[PDB]
Amino acid sequence: SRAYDLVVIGAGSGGLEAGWNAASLHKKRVAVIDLQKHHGPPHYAALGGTCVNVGCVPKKLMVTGANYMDTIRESAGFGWELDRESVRPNWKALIAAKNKAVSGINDSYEGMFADTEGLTFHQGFGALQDNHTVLVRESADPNSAVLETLDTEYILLATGSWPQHLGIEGDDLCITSNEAFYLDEAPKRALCVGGGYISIEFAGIFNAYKARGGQVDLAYRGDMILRGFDSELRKQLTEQLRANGINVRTHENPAKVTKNADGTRHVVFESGAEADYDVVMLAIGRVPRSQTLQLEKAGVEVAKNGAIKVDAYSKTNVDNIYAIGDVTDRVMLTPVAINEGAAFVDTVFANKPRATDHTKVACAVFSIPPMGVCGYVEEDAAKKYDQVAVYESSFTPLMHNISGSTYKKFMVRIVTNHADGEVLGVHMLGDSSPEIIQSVAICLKMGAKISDFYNTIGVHPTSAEELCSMRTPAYFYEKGKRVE
Amino acid sequence: SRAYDLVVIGAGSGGLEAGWNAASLHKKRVAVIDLQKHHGPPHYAALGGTCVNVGCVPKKLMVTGANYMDTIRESAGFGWELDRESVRPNWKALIAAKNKAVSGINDSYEGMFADTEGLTFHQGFGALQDNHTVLVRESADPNSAVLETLDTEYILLATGSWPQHLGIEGDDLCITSNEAFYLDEAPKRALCVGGGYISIEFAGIFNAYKARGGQVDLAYRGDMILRGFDSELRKQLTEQLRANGINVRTHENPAKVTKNADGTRHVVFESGAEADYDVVMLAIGRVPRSQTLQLEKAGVEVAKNGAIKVDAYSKTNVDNIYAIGDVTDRVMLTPVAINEGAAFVDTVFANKPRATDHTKVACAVFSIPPMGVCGYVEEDAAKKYDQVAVYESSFTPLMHNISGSTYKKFMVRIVTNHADGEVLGVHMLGDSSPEIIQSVAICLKMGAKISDFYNTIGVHPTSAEELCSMRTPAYFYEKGKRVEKID
Numbered sequence: 017s018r019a020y021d022l023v024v025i026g027a028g029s030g031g032l033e034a035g036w037n038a039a040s041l042h043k044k045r046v047a048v049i050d051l052q053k054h055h056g057p058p059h060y061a062a063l064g065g066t067c068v069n070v071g072c073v074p075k076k077l078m079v080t081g082a083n084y085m086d087t088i089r090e091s092a093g094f095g096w097e098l099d100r101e102s103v104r105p106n107w108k109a110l111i112a113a114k115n116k117a118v119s120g121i122n123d124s125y126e127g128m129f130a131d132t133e134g135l136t137f138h139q140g141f142g143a144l145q146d147n148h149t150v151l152v153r154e155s156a157d158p159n160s161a162v163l164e165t166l167d168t169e170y171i172l173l174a175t176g177s178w179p180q181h182l183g184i185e186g187d188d189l190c191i192t193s194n195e196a197f198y199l200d201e202a203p204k205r206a207l208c209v210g211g212g213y214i215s216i217e218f219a220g221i222f223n224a225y226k227a228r229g230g231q232v233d234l235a236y237r238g239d240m241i242l243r244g245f246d247s248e249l250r251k252q253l254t255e256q257l258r259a260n261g262i263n264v265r266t267h268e269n270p271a272k273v274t275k276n277a278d279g280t281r282h283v284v285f286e287s288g289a290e291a292d293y294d295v296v297m298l299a300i301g302r303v304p305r306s307q308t309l310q311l312e313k314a315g316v317e318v319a320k321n322g323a324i325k326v327d328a329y330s331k332t333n334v335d336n337i338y339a340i341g342d343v344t345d346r347v348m349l350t351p352v353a354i355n356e357g358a359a360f361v362d363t364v365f366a367n368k369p370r371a372t373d374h375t376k377v378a379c380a381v382f383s384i385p386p387m388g389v390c391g392y393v394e395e396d397a398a399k400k401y402d403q404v405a406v407y408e409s410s411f412t413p414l415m416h417n418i419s420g421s422t423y424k425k426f427m428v429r430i431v432t433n434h435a436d437g438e439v440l441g442v443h444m445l446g447d448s449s450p451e452i453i454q455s456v457a458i459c460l461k462m463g464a465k466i467s468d469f470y471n472t473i474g475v476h477p478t479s480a481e482e483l484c485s486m487r488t489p490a491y492f493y494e495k496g497k498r499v500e
Numbered sequence: 501s502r503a504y505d506l507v508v509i510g511a512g513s514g515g516l517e518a519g520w521n522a523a524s525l526h527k528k529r530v531a532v533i534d535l536q537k538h539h540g541p542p543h544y545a546a547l548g549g550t551c552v553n554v555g556c557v558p559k560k561l562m563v564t565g566a567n568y569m570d571t572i573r574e575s576a577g578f579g580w581e582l583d584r585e586s587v588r589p590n591w592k593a594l595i596a597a598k599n600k601a602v603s604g605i606n607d608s609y610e611g612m613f614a615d616t617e618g619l620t621f622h623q624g625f626g627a628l629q630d631n632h633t634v635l636v637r638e639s640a641d642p643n644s645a646v647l648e649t650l651d652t653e654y655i656l657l658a659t660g661s662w663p664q665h666l667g668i669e670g671d672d673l674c675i676t677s678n679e680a681f682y683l684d685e686a687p688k689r690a691l692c693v694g695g696g697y698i699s700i701e702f703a704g705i706f707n708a709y710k711a712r713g714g715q716v717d718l719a720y721r722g723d724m725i726l727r728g729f730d731s732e733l734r735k736q737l738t739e740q741l742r743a744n745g746i747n748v749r750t751h752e753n754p755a756k757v758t759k760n761a762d763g764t765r766h767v768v769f770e771s772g773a774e775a776d777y778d779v780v781m782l783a784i785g786r787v788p789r790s791q792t793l794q795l796e797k798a799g800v801e802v803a804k805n806g807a808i809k810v811d812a813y814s815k816t817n818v819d820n821i822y823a824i825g826d827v828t829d830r831v832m833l834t835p836v837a838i839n840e841g842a843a844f845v846d847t848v849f850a851n852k853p854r855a856t857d858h859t860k861v862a863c864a865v866f867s868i869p870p871m872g873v874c875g876y877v878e879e880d881a882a883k884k885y886d887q888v889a890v891y892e893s894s895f896t897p898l899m900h901n902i903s904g905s906t907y908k909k910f911m912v913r914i915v916t917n918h919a920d921g922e923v924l925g926v927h928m929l930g931d932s933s934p935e936i937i938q939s940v941a942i943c944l945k946m947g948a949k950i951s952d953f954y955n956t957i958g959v960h961p962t963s964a965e966e967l968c969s970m971r972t973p974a975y976f977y978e979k980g981k982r983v984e985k986i987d
């Protein structure tokens with residue numbers, strides 16, 4: 017009666033969440049398809065998804081490793097004595113540790129499969145034959161052998177994204193975040209291309225594990241890194257990355273990349289400037305991975321960028337085909353993907369239609385120092401509200417007056433509908449800002465006003481307490497006009 | 501008009517808050533009185549309060565310093581190679597840096613007076629002659645040169661608390677937290693006596709800067725440390741302190757302390773056990789400091805413990821006399837004192853009456869690892885509601901599988917009113933919990949329900965997103981009784 021109730025193409029953040037719930041909560045027959053069961057080349061992403069394999073999880077362990085550079089230095093101010101010149105970072109050991117951590121998660125995923133009735137794993141490239149037939153092929157090649165044919169009621173596309181490349185000569189000389197997780201040795205000289213959070217987090221990792229004398233450049237075609245983040249936080253972070261040895265190059269981009277005789281690369285920038293590096297990592301952006309799904313065989317509509325068009329309930333134009341996650345180019349974050357997956361199951365296997373709310377979604381940038389952001393940026397709120405008030409506060413935590421890192425300022429900016437004092441967005445820069453922003457997200461989701469913040473008794477001493485001592489605005493926007 | 505509109509006895513968190521406001525916001529003549537204007541012996545506290553001089557500020561700087569011991573060690577899992585046997589704590593460097601830090605704040609406070617017409621600093625022991633006259637004597641002795649008299653409309657008593665002593669033979673060979681901030685060398689062996697947060701935070705500061713081979717014991721007469729904090733957290737913190745070398749000695753109390761030839765202290769416990777230590781620190785409590793204010797002259801009613809009885813608006817029994825901060829013995833934390841100080845200026849000077857809410861105040865304990873809590877512990881909620889749900893989650897963060905400090909579990913416990921799901925209390929144990937608890941406090945203020953928490957999209961990866969992943973109760977309390985499920 018149709019072999020399967022569900023066929024999920026992609027065992028990622030969204031796919032596993034949708035699959036597990038349908039199998040377990042609604043006892044459906046679910047086939048989940050993915051390229052491999054363990055992280056690593058050639059596919060990189062595997063059972064568990066981009067996050068577990070080549071994303072959030074390994075990035076966090078690496079950024080954590082990267083942080084010890086700073087703390088070893090800063091411990092001096094507090095009377096900690098050690099042979100500082102003997103200190104050496106071992107990348108090879110970091111990666112070893114990380115690999116063991118990732119494989120362990122991969123392995124736990126397999127157990128889940130054995131532990132669940134109706135949930136089965138199928139290896140191979142999934143593709144569509146029509147709206148009820150999912151092919152499982154040995155390669156992405158549209159005419160490689162078919163390993164399996166899956167007859168199904170519903171189809172859930174959850175294939176993720178993939179690293180964008182630039183069309184320049186030598187692009188094949190560059191690596192992406194995927195390969196970066198497997199580098200044999202830390203580059204001494206490195207170039208991260210791209211102004212987004214992934215580029216920035218990698219400059220930070222490289223910057224700490226590089227050999228004495230190394231250098232990390234960060235190129236970005238635009239005028240200021242992290243497009244879309246609070247502009248004031250953007251300039252500030254630029255300054256602190258610079259304070260730590262990262263050469264931030266706005267208005268730069270490779271034009272040609274050539275391999276030198278020693279292995280190293282050579283880069284010629286659109287400026288005319290040239291430079292040589294051990295590794296050139298593109299982190300220009302991510303693009304929806306729907307190119308080999310044969311979506312046309314089912315009549316599924318897609319956009320110029322390959323994103324599968326979905327409605328609030330993640331349904332494509334074909335009623336029995338749903339699509340969640342990065343492949344939908346809505347909000348490319350794991351928790352969002354997971355929510356959309358849970359909502360999908362509610363919607364189809366429980367008749368309780370739920371749409372994921374893609375607003376007030378908080379996020380963090382694990383740069384060193386990290387960012388924790390949520391809600392509107394001044395600019396956007398200004399174009400949607402009468403008059404908005406912007407509150408701002410900065411300070412150098414006391415410990416940093418003693419540690420050496422005087423450049424390390426903590427900043428909190430809050431944006432509000434000045435008419436009713438509703439908090440439209442809260443943006444912070446400084447350690448702990450990712451942990452802090454989570455609960456702030458609950459506030460924003462609840463409709464919190466600025467008087468809800470300053471009326472809560474502070475916790476002292478913490479950085480977070482600054483959130484509660486902001487009673488007067490710095491300036492305003494009246495009709496998109498920058499006022500007072 | 502009288503000489504002054506207000507005279508503030510105590511230039512601390514609350515007093516200074518009130519003084520500056522009445523002065524800089526209503527343009528009133530306000531005199532503020534403190535014993536000294538720079539931190540240190542013999543009075544320890546000074547202009548800026550207990551927090552600034554020998555409390556919050558220096559204890560946090562010194563806990564940060566203490567953390568480096570775990571940080572340096574944990575760095576190995578992540579590939580940091582260094583001569584491990586070369587790591588050495590230098591206590592005198594820490595003390596000097598803390599000293600430069602505090603003096604600087606002591607200085608800024610000074611500047612604040614120079615630039616506030618109306619705000620005036622006086623120096624000595626403020627005491628009362630009558631309800632409109634306060635004396636600033638030279639010393640605590642009533643037989644002291646009355647340095648000055650100040651005629652005044654309103655009096656604000658904001659003198660704080662002071663370490664509590666034991667009355668045992670040898671108490672004078674012991675120290676309290678005031679002296680601990682000035683020790684010349686880290687003790688190799690130390691006895692922290694007390695179960696509250698000051699004793700715990702100090703046990704971890706000493707545990708970190710001690711000479712190797714050294715040892716820190718925490719002794720507490722009670723059954724479990726942190727009386728008044730979540731029971732599970734209390735249990736879990738104890739094991740984590742034990743994991744890092746601290747000897748938690750429960751049902752233990754010094755019976756007598758004599759002096760050793762080498763100048764260490766020999767302590768005989770009520771149990772009969774005996775041990776030697778370099779420093780015996782008493783952190784058994786803090787008593788409200790109202791004993792030398794001559795309240796009997798202005799007729800202010802006082803508790804048995806010396807607490808100065810006030811009403812919701814902090815007014816005493818004599819209508820022109822207010823008391824705020826630790827001396828009222830309500831919630832002894834800086835932000836509460838500050839909040840009570842601003843409440844008072846609104847009430848008296850702007851006729852906009854305000855009562856500080858002493859409910860749902862978030863607080864943190866800077867132990868290693870730290871705690872951050874807000875709201876009711878489940879035992880109190882069960883007395884008030886017929887059905888209460890307790891949600892729980894604990895996980896070893898991943899970084900701790902690599903760092904090797906495998907014992908550092910993050911624990912999140914939420915207690916709700918099951919009738920409608922209102923969050924009654926949130927309690928966390930783990931790194932970053934002081935920071936996370938601040939925003940949670942904002943939710944609780946607003947009346948958040950558990951649904952509000954789990955309907956929020958998480959930030960990944962963080963320890964905090966765990967707050968948004970708890971949808972099923974662990975157990976409940978039905979009419980005060982613990983139950984596995986509501987029947």
Ligand SMILES: Cc1cc2nc3c(=O)[nH]c(=O)nc-3n(C[C@H](O)[C@H](O)[C@H](O)COP(=O)(O)OP(=O)(O)OC[C@H]3O[C@@H](n4cnc5c(N)ncnc54)[C@H](O)[C@@H]3O)c2cc1C
Pocket residue numbers: 025026027028029030031049050051059061062063064065066067070071072073075140141142143174175176177193214305308309340341342343347348349350351353960961
């Ligand atoms: C370096 C990096 C760091 C990131 N850090 C964070 C972070 O800290 N926090 C955060 O929230 N987000 C982070 N993200 C983003 C996050 O990983 C994604 O948003 C999220 O994983 C999207 O999940 P998904 O379910 O859409 O698909 P994915 O998790 O990407 O999984 C899709 C799966 O489908 C498989 N697949 C693709 N095509 C086929 C096919 N034809 N047949 C079979 N299987 C196929 C892929 O192998 C993949 O495993 C990061 C991303 C990157 C690249």
Ligand SMILES: Cc1cc2nc3c(=O)[nH]c(=O)nc-3n(C[C@H](O)[C@H](O)[C@H](O)COP(=O)(O)OP(=O)(O)OC[C@H]3O[C@@H](n4cnc5c(N)ncnc54)[C@H](O)[C@@H]3O)c2cc1C
Pocket residue numbers: 476477509510511512513514515533534535543545546547548549550551552554555556557559624625626627658659660661677698789792793824825826827831832833834835837
């Ligand atoms: C070790 C330690 C750590 C602490 N850590 C924290 C923490 O991390 N976070 C937190 O919120 N709280 C903490 N506290 C508590 C916090 O310091 C107090 O709750 C707060 O300072 C109380 O403020 P107050 O205004 O009541 O009085 P205080 O700040 O104590 O100020 C009272 C002032 O009055 C002066 N004074 C007293 N008597 C007289 C007199 N007769 N004449 C003139 N002047 C006089 C005193 O010198 C003192 O300066 C800590 C306390 C201690 C002891």
